[PDB]
Write a protein that binds this DNA or RNA. Structure first.
Ligand SMILES: [Zn+2]
Ligand SMILES: [Zn+2]
Ligand SMILES: [Zn+2]
Ligand SMILES: [Zn+2]
Lengths: 72, 74
DNA sequence: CCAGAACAGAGTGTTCTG
DNA sequence: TCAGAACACTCTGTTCTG
């Protein structure tokens, strides 16, 4: 019931990992797209519902470390 | 040499709300003071604020504005 | 149930003005 | 001079569709 990325209420298993709908589309957009993501911190940034917009670099790292896969 | 924003280090357009700043930090500060927002640092509150990363942490950005002396009083 | 599309909002940064 | 209004943009998030 809890997104393994941001801790928000999960909508199901997306791309191999239990996640919220916001993290689902964020991950796909991050993989397929082109951005400039740069951590302003130490790359330990806290990712939760309120702060997940703060550091997409760390959020995307968490997605990957959680094992999210587009071909899953 | 161009003038430098004391908040994010971008090119400064002049002195805004008491401090030499870029236009983006000018309008960011006004909106932060007047508005209701959720600003919580995801870091240690030491976050780097520059032109590229200034959008990352409005909490640290606002802190820098205040520490630089920005105010609406004059 | 889930992927992707369609739709919509938050926050930002610029130009324009007196 | 600098403060304010307002538009357009990016990144984001929810509802809809197959
Ligand atoms: Zn999530
Ligand atoms: Zn980070
Ligand atoms: Zn600035
Ligand atoms: Zn911060």
């Amino acid at each position: 019931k809890i997104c393994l990325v941001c801790g928000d209420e999960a909508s199901g298993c997306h791309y191999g990992v239990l996640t919220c709908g916001s993290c689902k589309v964020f991950f796909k957009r991050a993989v397929e797209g082109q951005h400039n993501y740069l951590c302003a911190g130490r790359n330990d940034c806290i990712i939760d519902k309120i702060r997940r917009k703060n550091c997409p670099a760390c959020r995307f790292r968490k997605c990957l470390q959680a094992g999210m896969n587009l071909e899953a």
